Design an enzyme around this catalytic site. Sequence first.
Site, PDB file in Angstrom:
ATOM      1  N   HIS B 120      55.518  50.060  41.882  1.00 22.44           N
ATOM      2  CA  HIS B 120      54.894  49.255  40.833  1.00 22.44           C
ATOM      3  C   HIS B 120      55.902  48.128  40.423  1.00 22.44           C
ATOM      4  CE1 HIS B 120      51.700  49.399  37.551  1.00 22.44           C
ATOM      5  NE2 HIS B 120      52.366  48.260  37.396  1.00 22.44           N
ATOM      6  N   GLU B 165      48.631  46.952  43.090  1.00 27.85           N
ATOM      7  CA  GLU B 165      48.204  45.534  43.019  1.00 27.85           C
ATOM      8  C   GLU B 165      48.931  44.618  44.059  1.00 27.85           C
ATOM      9  OE1 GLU B 165      48.030  44.126  38.978  1.00 27.85           O
ATOM     10  OE2 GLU B 165      46.938  45.884  38.292  1.00 27.85           O
ATOM     11  N   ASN B 292      41.996  48.626  39.504  1.00 27.24           N
ATOM     12  CA  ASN B 292      42.457  48.093  38.204  1.00 27.24           C
ATOM     13  C   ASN B 292      41.583  46.921  37.868  1.00 27.24           C
ATOM     14  OD1 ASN B 292      44.492  49.986  38.655  1.00 27.24           O
ATOM     15  ND2 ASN B 292      46.109  48.414  38.761  1.00 27.24           N
ATOM     16  N   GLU B 351      43.394  51.584  36.122  1.00 27.57           N
ATOM     17  CA  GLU B 351      43.752  50.776  34.979  1.00 27.57           C
ATOM     18  C   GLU B 351      42.531  50.078  34.418  1.00 27.57           C
ATOM     19  OE1 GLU B 351      46.768  47.772  35.842  1.00 27.57           O
ATOM     20  OE2 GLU B 351      48.231  49.258  36.541  1.00 27.57           O
TER      21      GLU B 351
END
Lengths: 445, 445
Positions: B120, B165, B292, B351
Site C-alpha cells: 500500500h 490501487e 475501492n 474501501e
Amino acid sequence: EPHRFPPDFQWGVATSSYQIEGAVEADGRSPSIWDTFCARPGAIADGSTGAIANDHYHRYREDIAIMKQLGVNAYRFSIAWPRILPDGRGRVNQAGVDFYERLVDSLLEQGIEPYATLYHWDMPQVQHDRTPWYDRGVVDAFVEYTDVITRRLSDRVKYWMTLNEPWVISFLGYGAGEHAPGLRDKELYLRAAHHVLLAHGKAMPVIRANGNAQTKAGIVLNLNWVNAASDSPEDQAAARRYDQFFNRWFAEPLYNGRYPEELLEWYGRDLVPVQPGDFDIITTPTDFLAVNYYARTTVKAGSTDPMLQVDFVRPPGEYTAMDWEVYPQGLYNILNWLHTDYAPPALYVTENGAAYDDQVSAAGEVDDPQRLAYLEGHFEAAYRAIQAGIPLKGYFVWSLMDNFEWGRGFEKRFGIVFVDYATQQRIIKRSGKWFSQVTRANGLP
Amino acid sequence: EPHRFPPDFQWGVATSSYQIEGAVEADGRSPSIWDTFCARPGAIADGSTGAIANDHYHRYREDIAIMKQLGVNAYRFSIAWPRILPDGRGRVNQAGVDFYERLVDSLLEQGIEPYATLYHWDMPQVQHDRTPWYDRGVVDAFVEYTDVITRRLSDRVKYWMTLNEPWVISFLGYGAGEHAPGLRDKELYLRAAHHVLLAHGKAMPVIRANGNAQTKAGIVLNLNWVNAASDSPEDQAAARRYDQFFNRWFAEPLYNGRYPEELLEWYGRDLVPVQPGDFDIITTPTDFLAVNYYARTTVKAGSTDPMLQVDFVRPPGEYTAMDWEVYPQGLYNILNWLHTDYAPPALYVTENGAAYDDQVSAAGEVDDPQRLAYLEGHFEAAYRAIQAGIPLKGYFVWSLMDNFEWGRGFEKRFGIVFVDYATQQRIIKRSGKWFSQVTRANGLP
Ligand code: NI
Ligand code: NI
Ligand code: NI
Ligand code: NI
C-alpha cells in the site's frame, strides 16, 4: 470546616523511574541493577520485572493529564541514570536527556512544578560493575551524572533531591539482600551508607553551581515512628538500636556530623570508612529535608534480625496489605522531632501512602475506602504539624498510580490511580477522586 | 422487514501502514519513498509528514478495542515492506515481523479476521533506488518480500491482497507527480502500471504455496463511475478515454490479457514494455476482486489534462471536502459491471468512505451527518447489489480513523473515529456509533 493549608502549599504525587517507565531497552537505555536483579529467582515475589511497568516512557502525556484531573500543583519523579549515561560515565545519551526535557516541558506547560530525584535506586549495571555503593569511587561517578543532567535541566527544574532513602539503598541493597544488587553483609551496608551520604554532599555544590538563585536541593530520608514493645530494659534497648539504625543513621551525620555512637560501637566503628573531611562534606547545607513516612514499627529484643538482635511486634490496630501498621500520629511526631532537633528551613513529605487489595467493580470503578481513610488521617497529621509552626511546604502521595513495587512486584498497589496491567488502562480510584477535591480545596475535607 | 445482509457478510474498516503507524524509525524500519517525498516542498498540502500519524505502531491494542466497539468482524490493513526488509531485500527484520505477528494475534483473539495488503505504497527508499516501479526488476523484489512475510503469517492470515490501487501507484506516483516518488512522465507511468500487474501475478503462486487450502488472494483496484458531460462525440470520446485510463487499464489485463486498445494506441503501444508470457502471468486466477469506490467523475473534451485531452465537470449535487461527487448509485453500477463483464467468484468493497470537515463539540462529540448519510447510501447500494445476485462478500469502510491522507496531509479526515492529533485521543464519531449498530444488526436499521 476550613482546615485549609498554607496558600502556596504544594500538593503532589510521586513516582520513580524504574517503577513506572518501562521501555527498558528504548533509546539507548542500558540495564540498571534492577533489570539484572529481577532475573534472580526469589527476588521478586510475583516473578515480575520492571520491563514494561506502567509504560510511562510512552504514556507520560496521558499521565500528566491524569495529574491535571487530580489537581496537583507538583510532581515528584526520578531520572534514570541508565538513560542519561548508559555507559555509566562519559558519553551523554541525547535521546535520554530528551525524554526528561519533554516530560519537564509538558509539566510546566500544565502548571505542575517538577521535583526531580537524581537517584532512586536504578544505577546502570555497567557502572555498578566498576563502582558499587561500597566502593568510594561511586561518589565521583554519581557527581558526574548529577553534573550532566543538572546542566541540561536546571533552567526548568528548581527543586532537586539527591538520593532517595539512603537506608534502603544501603541496607536493603547490601545488608539484607532484598533490593538490588542483592548482597547481605554488615560491612558492605555500612560502607554503602557512608558513600551515599558522601555522594549527597559532593552533589549539592554541583547542583547549586549549575542552577541559579532559585535552586533548592536536599536529600530524601525514609523515617517511621518507632516504639518499644514494653518497658523492659532489653526492649527499650532494642527499640533504641532500631531507631538509631532506621531513623538516625543518616540524619545525625547530615546535621551533626556524627553517626549514632551506641549503634556505631555495636557494629564495630572501623567498618565505616570515614576519611578526614567527610563530615564537612556530608553536612553541606541543604534547603530542605524531604521525608518518606509510612508506618509505626514496634520492637522487642529478639533474634529475628541477628545483626540488631531485635524482633518485631504488631500492636492491635489497622494494617495495610504490606503488613504495615497505620499510625497517622507518627507523621506528626516525626515532623516534630526533625523540626525541634535539626531545625531544617523547610520540610516536605515526599512520600506517604498505602497499599490495599483493590478490585475493579462491575461498574468499572475502584472503591478503596481503606486507602482513603489512610490518606485522610495523615493529611490531618500534616495539617496539625503546620499549625504547630513546623515548616512543611508540601505533601506528595505515594503513588500517582499502581506500579512495580520492588521486591513485592506488581501485587502491591500504592496508587490513587489503578492500572489494569493487561491493557495499561488507568482508572482513578475513589481515593484519587477524593484527593482531586483536597487539592482544589487546599485541603480538608 | 429489515434489509439484512448475508449471514457471513464481513463488515470491516480499513487502514494502510504509512497512514497510521508512525514510529518511522522504530525497531529497524528504514525510510519508505513516502518518508522522502514528504520532505518535498509543495508535496503535502498542510506541510505534514507521516512521522507520527496515529501512532498505531504503539497504540494498536487500543485501536483493536475500538474495532470491538465498532462491532467489525474484519480488519483491512497493510504491511510495511520497510519494517520487514529494511534493506529492501536480504536480511529479515525480526522486530518488524514481530509487530505484525502481535497485531494479527491480537486481532484473532478478538475474533476479528485479518485482511492483509502486501503493498500500500510504501516501498523502502533503498529498494526504490535499485528498482523503481518502471524497472522490471521490481517484480522479483516484491515477490521476495511477499515470500518472506507470507511464510511468517500464512498460518494466521487467510485473506491477502497483493497491491493496492495500481492506478495510483503508477499514475499518481510516476505520471502526475502527486504521490511518491513524485515523477511525471507518460512512459514511466505505463512501465510502472505494467510492472505492478506483473508483481501481482508473480506474487499469487507464492502466496498460494506459502498458504493452505483456505488461502484467498486478489488485487485491489480503485474504480469510480464515469460519465460523459454531454452527448457530443468529443465528450463521449473523452469520457471513454478516461474510463479506459481509470477503470479498465488494469481490469482488462487481469481478466482478458489485453490493455484497452484505443487508449493504448493513443499513448503509443511501444511504451508499455510487454514481454512474452506477461499476460499469462497477469491473468493468474484470483479468489476475489477487491474494489475501492468513492465517486462519480464527469468528463468533457478539454486541454486541462494534456495527456488525455480531458476536462472535469461537476454536476449539481452533493460534494465531500475532497471535492468528490457523492453518487452511491455508482457503487452498484461498478459492482454490476464487474460481475457481468468479468464474473469474479467473489467481490469485496475494500474501501468506501468520505471526508467532511469535522469539529469536536463542546460536549466532546463529533456530529458528522454528512459522512453518515454518505455511508448509508453506499451501504444501501451494496445491499441492492447482493439482492441482484452479485457475490459481494464484505465491505470495509475507509477509514477506521482519521489519518495521513497522502498529498492532502492530515487536513482531510476520512475516519468514522476522530483523532485529536495534539493528544492522540480517539473519539468515535456519530457515523461510527451508527456503524456500530449496522454491524451488530448485520444490515441497515
Ligand atoms: Ni479544627
Ligand atoms: Ni426494502
Ligand atoms: Ni516506542
Ligand atoms: Ni525495455
